[PDB]
Amino acid sequence: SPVRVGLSVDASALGHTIPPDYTGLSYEQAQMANPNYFSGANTQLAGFLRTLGRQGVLRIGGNTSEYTFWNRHAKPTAADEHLAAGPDKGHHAAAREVITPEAVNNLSEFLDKTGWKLIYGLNLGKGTPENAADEAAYVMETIGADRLLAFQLGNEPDLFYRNGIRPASYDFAAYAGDWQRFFTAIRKRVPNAPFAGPDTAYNTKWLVPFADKFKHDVKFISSHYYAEGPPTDPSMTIERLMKPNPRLLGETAGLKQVEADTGLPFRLTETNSCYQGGKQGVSDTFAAALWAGDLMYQQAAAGSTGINFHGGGYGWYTPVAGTPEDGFIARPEYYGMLLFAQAGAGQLLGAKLTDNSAAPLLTAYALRGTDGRTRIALFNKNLDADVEVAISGVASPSGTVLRLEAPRADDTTDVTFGGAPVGASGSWSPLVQEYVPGHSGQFVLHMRKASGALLEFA
Numbered sequence: 001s002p003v004r005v006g007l008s009v010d011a012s013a014l015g016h017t018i019p020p021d022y023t024g025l026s027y028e029q030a031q032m033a034n035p036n037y038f039s040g041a042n043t044q045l046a047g048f049l050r051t052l053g054r055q056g057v058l059r060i061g062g063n064t065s066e067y068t069f070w071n072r073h074a075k076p077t078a079a080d081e082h083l084a085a086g087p088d089k090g091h092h093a094a095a096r097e098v099i100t101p102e103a104v105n106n107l108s109e110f111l112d113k114t115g116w117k118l119i120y121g122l123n124l125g126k127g128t129p130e131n132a133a134d135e136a137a138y139v140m141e142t143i144g145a146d147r148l149l150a151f152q153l154g155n156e157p158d159l160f161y162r163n164g165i166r167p168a169s170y171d172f173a174a175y176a177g178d179w180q181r182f183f184t185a186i187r188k189r190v191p192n193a194p195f196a197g198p199d200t201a202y203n204t205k206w207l208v209p210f211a212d213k214f215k216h217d218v219k220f221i222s223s224h225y226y227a228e229g230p231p232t233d234p235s236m237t238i239e240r241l242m243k244p245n246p247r248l249l250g251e252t253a254g255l256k257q258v259e260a261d262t263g264l265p266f267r268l269t270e271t272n273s274c275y276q277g278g279k280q281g282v283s284d285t286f287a288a289a290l291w292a293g294d295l296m297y298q299q300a301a302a303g304s305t306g307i308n309f310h311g312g313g314y315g316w317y318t319p320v321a322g323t324p325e326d327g328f329i330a331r332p333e334y335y336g337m338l339l340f341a342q343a344g345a346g347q348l349l350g351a352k353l354t355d356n357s358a359a360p361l362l363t364a365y366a367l368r369g370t371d372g373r374t375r376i377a378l379f380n381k382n383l384d385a386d387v388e389v390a391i392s393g394v395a396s397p398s399g400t401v402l403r404l405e406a407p408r409a410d411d412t413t414d415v416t417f418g419g420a421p422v423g424a425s426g427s428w429s430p431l432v433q434e435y436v437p438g439h440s441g442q443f444v445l446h447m448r449k450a451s452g453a454l455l456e457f458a
């Protein structure tokens, strides 16, 4: 008894072109203490990234970027060789960590193995302008201008007061002074250094004035987004995660207005479902695959240049979990990102849903792929409604579907895409071929409650 909905694809209703480096991941700066983590020797993790995209961006930053210190004079410690730095849980100060030349050297080899570009945090919370200049210089020397997309000067400077990185009086004016002192010092060592900022969630007292003041000094605006609101909200649940987020829609409009005003594009450089490394039973579940995959397309359709899902260690929300010693595994959220990866880049098209008020959390995105083939990504985020989608507007002799599936929305395992789990080192290929029945120039796709689908048309 599915809800019977219509989907009308309009090849003339042109949306944004998804860039090839749209996908991405965010990690804590602290992880750079361990030269074995972002290393050319870390073939497993490099494989996971390549499966997410042949192009993409690795962002390193986070709350630990205020507690992490480049030391050109240092070599990794024995403890550094086993450090697994998951998402910062925001409870108190992170441990002090040291980044060495060796770790930067190894990060360059990791970027060469993955083909991803880098956003690299510098320590404006507690470090000096001169050490940021020295760190930037070594990153530029070692990673190179082609792979280095941007430096960032502080992570979430609007929240520095929370753990005493700044006094409660710290405001945009104080941060602009800091930012300019760091920018000037860095540009003396690295005249071509690229920047992004302010590396926080959209707001009127920080991000808007940042863009106005520093629009000639940055390449793009870096924003953050978590589906979970402030801690006074009802605890985020799977049910809530599947629903529209009016805060997201408003902040995205805010970023679009900044782009119109300043010319600066925006990237979502730290995102995930829930704070503090995630919420067990929400962030580490199949629902996070549906949420993440749908978010990637929602933001692409809104004109975002890309995304970076925060993670690392064994954090509840991490796309990829594990360590070089123990191995790495794809978590449920990774499968949402994998659906996006398999769809590929291209230009979004109009895709209007009708007769869908009883299945209101179904989303759909149509894409003219760079290879000329039409694809449709659907997320049936309705937890209790199966759907039957009558697809009009596509003329093709053959459509196939790859399904994003788990037996329950709160599953922490049992997730597959195209009838297969992801294996070691990001290995994935589809194992189930399913055609979508076509008649009268239309197709009909069934989707179970709490599932996703990627359709490809010949």
Ligand SMILES: *[C@@H]1[C@H](O)[C@@H](O)[C@H](O)[C@@H](C(=O)O)[C@H]1O
Residues within 6 Å of the ligand: 061, 062, 063, 064, 086, 087, 088, 089, 090, 155, 156, 270, 274, 275, 276, 277, 278, 310
């Ligand atoms: C973003 C912050 O910069 C990260 O260090 C945290 O791990 C995230 C989280 O709470 O999960 C965000 O605040």
